[PDB]
């Protein structure tokens, strides 16, 4: 996001406003703003890996813009569109990756690729050497907003079960 | 399948060193996923957008 230091309304503000996002929602639900159409009029700007050494970033769109759960300058130029987007494909599946040890997240990221489920829909027609398809895939009850864009909810991996954490004496 | 398209790889060596790009770097922020890596003899080499 590009942030204009100047503001007639006062202190500082990122240029985009509510009208633009309303137009975006309207365009989407029509089933004519595109991401490109956001680019042209100067609302978001691409940043290569080199520039960051000359830019200050605001994590939240409200972190310091104006004047128990958890722990939370005035010269920002760009604000992150959303922090949860620093992940990749596989890690996006992990629910609450913040709330566990990082190597455990790495273990899961590597392992999830070894899970069955569905891989396409034409498989009844598509020959192949190897193929796994399970009976009753279920979209997990827990989920993040991301994998909706990953079409994951459409093509789930496993199915949830009623687990119990106990030592029932044998195995 | 999606996690196999946006994939990278660099040649460094057969066995490997232990003070060079295997460990993550500050510059990697927001460009390459900081957890989606294989482990063993290639950890920190293959990395994911």
């Amino acid at each position: 996001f590009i942030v204009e230091d100047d503001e007639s309304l006062g202190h500082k503000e990122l240029k985009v406003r509510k009208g633009h996002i309303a137009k975006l929602m309207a365009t989407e639900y029509q089933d004519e703003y595109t991401w490109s159409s956001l680019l042209n009029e100067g609302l978001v700007e691409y940043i290569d890996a080199e520039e960051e050494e000359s830019i200050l970033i605001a994590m939240q769109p409200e972190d310091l813009e104006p004047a128990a759960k958890r722990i939370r300058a005035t010269t920002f130029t760009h604000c992150e569109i959303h922090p949860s987007m620093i992940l990749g494909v596989a890690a996006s599946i992990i629910p609450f990756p913040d709330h566990n040890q990082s190597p455990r997240n790495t273990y899961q990221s590597a392992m999830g690729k070894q899970a069955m489920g569905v891989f396409l829909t034409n498989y009844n027609v598509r020959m192949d050497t190897m193929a796994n398809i399970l009976y009753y895939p279920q979209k997990p009850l827990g989920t993040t907003r991301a994998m909706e864009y990953l079409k994951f909810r459409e093509l789930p991996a496993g199915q949830n079960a009623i687990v119990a954490i106990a030592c029932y004496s044998g195995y | 399948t999606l996690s196999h398209l946006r994939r990278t790889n660099t040649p460094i060596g057969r066995d490997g060193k232990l003070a060079k790009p295997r460990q993550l770097h500050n510059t990697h922020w927001g460009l390459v996923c900081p957890a989606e890596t294989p482990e063993g003899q290639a950890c920190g080499l293959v990395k994911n957008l």
Binding site: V16, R17, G19, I21, W35 | -
Partner: peptide
């Protein structure tokens, strides 16, 4: 209002548009 600021929640719409345009394999395709 239309000139009001944006709540952190609202960012998701922008992301939705961005994916709807670009597509994941954009790198290889382009």
């Amino acid at each position: 209002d239309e000139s009001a600021p944006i709540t952190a929640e609202d960012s998701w719409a922008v992301i939705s548009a961005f994916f709807r345009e670009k597509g994941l394999v954009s790198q290889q395709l382009d």
